[PDB]
Design a protein around this ligand. Sequence first.
Ligand code: HEM
Length: 154
Amino acid sequence: MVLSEGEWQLVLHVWAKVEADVAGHGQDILIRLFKSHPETLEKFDRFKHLKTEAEMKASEDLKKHGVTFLTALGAILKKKGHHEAELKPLAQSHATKHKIPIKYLEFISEAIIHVLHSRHPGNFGADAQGAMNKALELFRKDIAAKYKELGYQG
Ligand code: HEM
């Protein structure tokens, strides 16, 4: 699929706001994901044990991963679609080492959209959400094709 420059603009305009606090958005998003879809916390051998949202908020490791994953996503979105190089090592490690099904990438895309909507209502109206959703669907479709080339999930 292909986004128009206008759509990339809306995505990078609200992302510039997220970047003012990467560790805070990374936490919110992961907690939203784990509270909504608790089965996803099982994939993390380092935090699996956390039982509550308070314990999640206080975990430094969880916050460190939030910064790690969000930074990578930000580096992919900034490419505006030209992200083949970036995707390769990510698809390999999520398909062979972590084993993250496409369905989970859809769950975290819903978490990203829930948090941006909460924190940035003004910069995340309907058109800006439609664009963000398109950019994440583009990210999932390319990762899913790479997963098939790599022998995973199919
Ligand atoms: C927006 C999509 C996502 C991005 C950009 C992303 C990015 C990353 C990055 C950069 C790392 C570190 C390097 C590596 O191992 O590849 C990582 C590790 C990891 N990611 Fe993902 N990720 C995404 C979605 C997910 C989801 C949905 C899950 C699980 C339900 C997941 C599970 C993990 C796990 C288990 C590790 C290892 C963490 C630790 O042991 O240090 N990722 N991810």
